Design a protein around this ligand. Structure first.
Ligand SMILES: O=C(O)[C@@H]1O[C@@H](O[C@H]2[C@H](O)[C@H](O)[C@H](O[C@H]3[C@H](O)[C@H](O)[C@H](O)O[C@H]3C(=O)O)O[C@H]2C(=O)O)[C@@H](O)[C@@H](O)[C@@H]1O
Ligand SMILES: O=C(O)C1=C[C@H](O)[C@H](O)[C@H](O[C@H]2[C@H](O)[C@H](O)[C@H](O[C@H]3[C@H](O)[C@H](O)[C@H](O)O[C@H]3C(=O)O)O[C@H]2C(=O)O)O1
Lengths: 379, 380
């Protein structure tokens, strides 16, 4: 499979069994095709579909509200907003690209993966329509920056924390590699998207917000590099992937994993079991890419000997019994998010207990959740 | 005496008197409230018709919302029929603009009407009236007097009345319209149209199948149904029905929902059981504000089965002191501040000084813009 943001071993396995006519996989993929029909019909979304413009006056600039920031009722105008960690302010739904970037990413990811498995041009054609409109269209495509992501009303300082919103469309950028060679994805489409991704990568690496987010000491820094690797893999910069893993990701794990395997930065959050998991999910998506060029992020040590498997070990009994979690968790933890994580970490580590638990938790066979498409092994 | 309506009339009367006498503490407080209310003077009046997705009637004037705990079923190709996840609000609710717009309207109209009653400034009555006309009576922008499509659920086959509870945000604004009668801005023609709207809404509430079913609900839905009912009846000056509703529906429902230890078993089985225990009593509290203005105290009057609402407060009081000791499901954090007004209301009605003290110790923030706290300077 081409380099991209997915378990390549599982995708290659699905395509091969589908091409041999294997009954269980053929039936599974035929279910997924029924699920994907809505994305063939879906009108492509654009970041420009908003009324309230960002301070640039440019509808092509992505803008969202940082989700944990609320108006202050003791201020006459509610300004400046104040932080309530773990409490999502419903005002976030006033910025259409918060949910539309998710809907776009799901649509393009599903369609590109189904084109890779089946070879049906109808999937590449629809994938291409979503990609062109979200990324490259000179009127409807988004500017390659995250300047106004997770803005906060009244906040004086610039922040890079909104960059983490990019993971919702950077997975779609990576899956675009899967539709290269189709009739629908022309050399002109590829050149424009190569150019967009080059500009997005430039902004990521050199803007102040990008720089600050690259140095964040919690899951923001881990997710930044997961996104970075998606952009770099799209652009075939395998040398850069090696450098990022060795000079950013591994040092970050070494600093963020404690000696007992806990993630102290996540333990002080109000949703601490969720944010411990979210950190490892960032490592999990990074590893899907690094392991396609021979770097296993679950078992490769930092310079201090700490390994990401130690973080899984610490959390494993709490994936078995979330009720035993002893740190602040002000909403219930969804055990199901452990399923793909424990499968990913278990296979990478040869840890059969992890894989068994991933299957016992499982995923629903007929779920339409697009990220579960490769994981028939869990359904 | 203040007009009959959905507010603590004793505190409102005391604010108006002190304000007219020039008392410093009250004058300063009301001047803050006036600064707060300025955004409502400028605010463009909202309308239920400001939606794109129309309801099955094809009438933009029909109120329609999504029942908040119902979600697409990902294991179905079209996600239909939706399934219930108690206590987990599905963000799709924000696709129906009147969910939050009925809230914003209710806040604007309540604040402006209360401030006209306290200050006598015509500017507050004029703005209040603009919001009322647009939301209720306007022949194009005003809502139809029903809740047929409130809290609909995609794929659900049966009709439900559970969405009626959405009415409490605008029925409080209806009640406060009584406060602007006599202003120059609220004409006799305006009052007549709103009287006719409220009469039609009252008919729908009482005689539609959805209204009848909600009137029979065995949990906080039944209590909120009658709290809303009293607001409509008080707006219409039907003091006879207020007495009958209190004696024949509210007290028997309240008595039937209270267990031997004072707990509310219908609310204890919810995923937000401390919230829904509190929410049940808030319905009784708002109901009592109206009944006690004609001499019926719902906190201390026993039902015919011997149960009295004070017993429910007694059960919950230690958990307002320490919400973490709550031993039932509460999958999101409980806001202790919601205990403040509840304990003041129940404490004052019962002569329980322990409750009132706790109410002030928890307190409300002096400068808050929350319109429901306007009468409660005693807590600020
Ligand atoms: O005030 C409230 O409790 C409201 O809660 C939500 O309504 C709930 C509530 O449990 C209702 O009593 C009703 O429950 C029904 C329903 O059939 C439910 O599916 C289950 O079978 O129990 C029934 C019962 O208790 O008799 O509807 C529930 C629902 O989520 O639809 C909402 O109305 C909410 O807005 C309000 O806060
Ligand atoms: O942790 C996440 O991945 C995350 C996702 C949400 O979308 C949102 O970005 C949220 O971010 C919060 C997290 O604490 C960030 O690390 C940052 O925290 C900074 C913030 O200014 C905070 O008040 C304090 O100063 O810590 C800062 C830091 O850099 O640690 O933003 C948080 C926020 O809620 O904005 O979590």
């Amino acid at each position: 499979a081409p380099l991209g943001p997915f378990n390549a071993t599982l995708l290659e396995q699905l395509k091969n069994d589908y091409q041999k006519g294997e009954k269980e996989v053929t039936r599974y993929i035929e279910l997924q095709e029924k699920v994907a029909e809505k994305y063939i019909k879906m009108t492509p979304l654009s970041v420009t579909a908003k009324k309230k413009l960002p301070p640039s006056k440019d509808p092509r600039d992505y803008m969202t509200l940082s989700p944990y920031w609320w108006p202050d009722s003791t201020k006459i105008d509610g300004l400046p907003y104040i932080r309530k960690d773990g409490e999502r302010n419903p005002e976030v739904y006033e910025y259409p690209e918060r949910e539309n970037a998710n809907r776009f990413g799901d649509a393009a990811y599903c369609l590109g993966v189904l084109y890779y498995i089946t070879g049906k041009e109808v999937y590449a054609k629809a994938c291409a329509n979503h990609l062109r409109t979200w990324f490259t269209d000179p009127k409807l495509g988004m500017n390659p920056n995250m300047t106004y992501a997770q803005a906060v009303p009244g906040m004086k300082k610039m922040r890079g924390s909104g960059f983490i919103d990019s993971r919702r469309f950077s997975r779609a950028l990576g899956v675009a590699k899967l539709i290269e060679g189709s009739k629908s994805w022309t050399p002109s489409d590829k050149k424009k998207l190569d150019d967009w991704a080059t500009a997005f990568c430039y902004w990521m690496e050199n803007s102040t917000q990008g720089q600050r987010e690259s140095h964040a000491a919690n899951n923001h820094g881990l997710w930044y590099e997961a996104i970075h690797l998606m952009v770099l893999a799209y652009l075939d910069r395998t040398d850069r992937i090696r450098e990022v893993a060795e000079q950013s990701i591994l040092p970050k794990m070494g600093a963020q994993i404690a000696d007992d395997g806990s993630l102290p930065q996540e333990l002080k959050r109000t949703l601490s079991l969720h944010y411990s998991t979210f950190a490892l999910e960032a490592l999990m998506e990074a590893n899907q890419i690094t392991s396609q060029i021979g770097i296993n992020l679950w078992s490769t040590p930092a310079s201090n000997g700490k390994v990401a498997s130690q973080a899984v070990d610490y959390l494993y009994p709490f994936y078995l019994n979330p009720e035993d979690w002893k740190f602040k968790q002000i909403k219930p933890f969804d055990q199901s998010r452990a399923a793909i994580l424990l499968y990913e970490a278990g296979t990478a580590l040869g840890n059969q207990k992890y894989v068994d638990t991933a299957k016992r938790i499982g995923l629903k066979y007929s779920t339409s959740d697009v990220e579960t498409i490769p994981y028939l092994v869990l359904k």
